[PDB]
Design an enzyme around this catalytic site. Structure first.
Site, PDB file in Angstrom:
ATOM      1  N   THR B 120       0.837  -1.179   0.000  1.00 56.01           N
ATOM      2  CA  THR B 120       0.000   0.000   0.000  1.00 56.01           C
ATOM      3  C   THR B 120       0.894   1.260   0.000  1.00 56.01           C
ATOM      4  OG1 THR B 120      -0.261   0.017   2.411  1.00 56.01           O
ATOM      5  CG2 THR B 120      -1.905  -1.109   1.143  1.00 56.01           C
ATOM      6  N   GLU B 147      -5.951 -11.096   5.128  1.00 56.76           N
ATOM      7  CA  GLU B 147      -4.930 -11.834   5.854  1.00 56.76           C
ATOM      8  C   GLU B 147      -5.563 -13.128   6.399  1.00 56.76           C
ATOM      9  OE1 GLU B 147      -1.459 -11.197   9.201  1.00 56.76           O
ATOM     10  OE2 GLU B 147      -3.067  -9.706   9.001  1.00 56.76           O
ATOM     11  N   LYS B 199      -8.308   1.588  -3.908  1.00 56.86           N
ATOM     12  CA  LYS B 199      -8.631   1.049  -2.585  1.00 56.86           C
ATOM     13  C   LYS B 199      -9.068   2.087  -1.615  1.00 56.86           C
ATOM     14  CE  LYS B 199      -6.044  -2.182  -0.837  1.00 56.86           C
ATOM     15  NZ  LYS B 199      -4.706  -2.871  -0.530  1.00 56.86           N
ATOM     16  N   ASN B 203     -12.554   1.375   0.065  1.00 61.36           N
ATOM     17  CA  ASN B 203     -12.630   1.190   1.521  1.00 61.36           C
ATOM     18  C   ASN B 203     -13.402   2.314   2.163  1.00 61.36           C
ATOM     19  OD1 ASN B 203     -11.232  -1.172   1.375  1.00 61.36           O
ATOM     20  ND2 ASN B 203      -9.290  -0.335   2.083  1.00 61.36           N
ATOM     21  N   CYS B 255      -7.672  -0.967   8.734  1.00 61.49           N
ATOM     22  CA  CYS B 255      -7.811  -0.392   7.423  1.00 61.49           C
ATOM     23  C   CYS B 255      -8.770   0.780   7.285  1.00 61.49           C
ATOM     24  CB  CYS B 255      -8.312  -1.488   6.534  1.00 61.49           C
ATOM     25  SG  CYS B 255      -8.520  -1.038   4.877  1.00 61.49           S
ATOM     26  N   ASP B 259      -7.765   4.562   6.272  1.00 59.56           N
ATOM     27  CA  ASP B 259      -7.973   4.928   4.872  1.00 59.56           C
ATOM     28  C   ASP B 259      -8.948   6.085   4.716  1.00 59.56           C
ATOM     29  OD1 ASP B 259      -6.229   2.863   4.236  1.00 59.56           O
ATOM     30  OD2 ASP B 259      -7.606   1.808   2.957  1.00 59.56           O
TER      31      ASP B 259
END
Lengths: 387, 387
Positions: B120, B147, B199, B203, B255, B259
């Site tokens: 990222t 993950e 992303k 997100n 995340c 983000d």
């Protein structure tokens, strides 16, 4: 079972539900305008809807119309209330007079009929009117129909929601499923106030999505990036999807601007940031679009075809730049103090910047001075907001 | 074709891409830790991922690991950069040092290798580093992996996006499709900065959806309504959907909180209301949840299982009410100045209100004092945000 269902209100919502149900039960449509009643009894639809017209003229429906309230309501098992209502955001006034007049009439004439309100009403209406009049025979059921495709949407509904959890609510949902072409239709039974809140929350989410993709587009224009590349990559996430992701000058129409404001008023005592921002975001997007057009220093701005574009026009005019409109459907020579131009070639020649909600082959000729943020307006299978 | 692909960074992103590609090409994983290199060469995965472990141990992969940069990079056709990076919202600092170190090393050792950054990175990174170093052989491609399920997500990807429009970008996308189990995977080629923005926008939309359904839930609790009835009716619109609609104490994880803030910082010069409101809405929701719990006047609040719930704990403690935590996975007796209680029965007895992200059979015993807004946490097939 072969029931009697009366329709009170013969606009697209009432008539599409009446025609759907008349395939299997007895349906009586009440309307005080004799000419419409006569049309209906002559199997002619008073509204524009291809399938309603076809079904009325070609299928054996147990359907009739009358101007007489007693004839209409007597012996009805259900009465569908689909009369006009209106919410005014400036005053936070929801006019439900036509619905309350029908509830008065049905209660007097046939107190055993179960009323199903399909008209749009404020959150809390049905629980409050039942308590006020001391009656129990009123249930709200949202309609998810598009004007012009209303019978089609009743034949293939997204879902059926009835705002009462009871056997009589389920029998009404069964009427709707029996008449439909779509099978195994998702069916939900809720309590009353929850059912009344569904369309506001669904429509406000759709406005939120238009507003979000429009802020993505403001960023892409500001940063010199390709909006379509970003939106296509984002929407390939299956939890996001390739729908309602078409940049525009703002969400509009007769529904989203009012419902978002109606919901915000209902949040007066509930902490929030997203509900209020959906309303504010549309003003910010219109300001950003108008500022972009004004940065090109046009002496005349042309609007190719004619609600959010009207907000852009207001902002351009506020800066003293004239706006001309190309709109063949419009017969007047002026709209909101702006000239309407009949000749396309003259319009293209005079306009320094031409703004539109969709690129059109007619503008290919002058694409360099056309400003549109539309990406999917010419993809006929793409699902997005349009007004 | 039988290419050489080097993986620089052996965490889940690099290793899942390496194992996927090693089914058909030559893959060399570079890692300076000898113990991990040895494990990998002994066909033992250094990370927890069932499919990576199974593929390494049971399939004939042309895969090896080395601690030597020259051995790793020489003759590579592509080098996948999947080293650690971190964005700090408080200072708006994106640490890309590991990626820049690999770009330095590859440029020196094999200037003809094409680097694919899966780590990222900030929006604009690749266009800027290419200009800065005067090199052309760097392309960004987002990773959409979970993950723990990273090889699975590479075998069944939502889509493949490569941030360059060229034949060498397409050949890399073909490597990813060749190794996958899923067929006809949506593939998109974009320019660089647009790929880097995907992303963040995807997100942030998911955070927006969590925030919106949480504001719907704040309203339902405030108004005494059934949140599930409203959410089920709303989400039956196919343009809305039954996913990412689970009320909670706020979106969280490693995340979404970062983000959303990273994207907001990128909007410093772009007019907006929705982007900023997504961040603010989470604080407002946590305040609303804490206020609801505090209104019950608990003397002790218990947290059943252990990021947004931590925000609730902070607010309860700010009011001087003690918090106790039930979390078997935790070995310490204190977490952020709050006692961790090992015995469930003692925890249930002491806590006046027990807050949790999911109702559990273990709490059925004390459901009357359990506060959770979760609706779908026990539906294992339901897709929503979880942290």
């Amino acid at each position: 079972e072969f029931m009697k269902i009366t329709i009170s209100g013969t606009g697209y919502v009432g008539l599409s539900n009446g025609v759907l149900i008349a395939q299997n039960h007895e349906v009586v449509a009440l309307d005080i305008v004799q000419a419409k009643v006569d049309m209906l009894n002559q199997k002619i639809s008073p509204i524009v809807d291809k399938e309603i017209q076809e079904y009325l003229a070609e299928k054996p429906l147990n359907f009739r119309a009358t101007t007489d309230k007693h004839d209409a309501y007597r012996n009805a098992d259900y009465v569908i209330i689909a009369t006009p209502t209106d919410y005014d955001p400036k005053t936070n006034y929801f006019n439900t007079s036509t619905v309350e007049a029908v509830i008065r009439d049905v209660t007097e004439i046939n107190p055993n009929a179960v009323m199903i309100i399909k008209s749009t009403i404020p959150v809390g209406f049905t629980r409050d009117i039942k308590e006020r009049l001391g009656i129990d025979n009123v249930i709200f059921s949202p309609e998810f129909l598009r004007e012009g495709r209303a019978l089609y949407d009743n034949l293939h509904p997204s879902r059926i929601v009835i705002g009462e959890r009871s056997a009589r609510a389920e029998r009404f949902a069964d009427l709707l499923k029996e008449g439909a072409i779509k099978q195994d239709i998702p069916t939900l039974f809720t309590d009353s106030t929850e059912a009344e809140a569904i369309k506001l929350f669904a429509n406000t989410y759709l406005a939120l999505r238009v507003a979000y993709f429009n802020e993505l587009d403001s960023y892409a224009e500001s940063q010199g990036l390709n909006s379509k590349q970003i939106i296509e990559g984002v929407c390939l996430d299956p939890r996001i999807g390739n729908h309602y992701n078409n940049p525009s000058f703002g969400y509009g129409g007769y529904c989203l601007p009012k419902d978002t404001k109606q919901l915000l008023a209902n949040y007066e005592s509930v902490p929030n940031n997203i509900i209020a921002a959906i309303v504010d975001a549309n003003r910010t997007r219109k300001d950003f679009i108008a500022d972009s057009i004004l940065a090109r220093k046009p002496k005349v701005v042309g609007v190719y075809r004619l609600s959010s574009i009207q907000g852009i026009m207001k902002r351009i005019k506020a800066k003293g730049i004239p706006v001309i409109i190309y709109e063949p459907v419009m017969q007047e020579d002026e709209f909101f103090n702006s000239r309407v131009v009949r000749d396309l070639n003259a319009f293209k020649q005079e306009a320094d910047v031409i703004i539109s909600n969709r690129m059109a082959e007619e503008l290919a000729d002058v694409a360099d001075k056309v400003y549109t943020r539309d990406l999917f307006g010419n993809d006929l299978e793409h699902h997005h907001h349009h007004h």
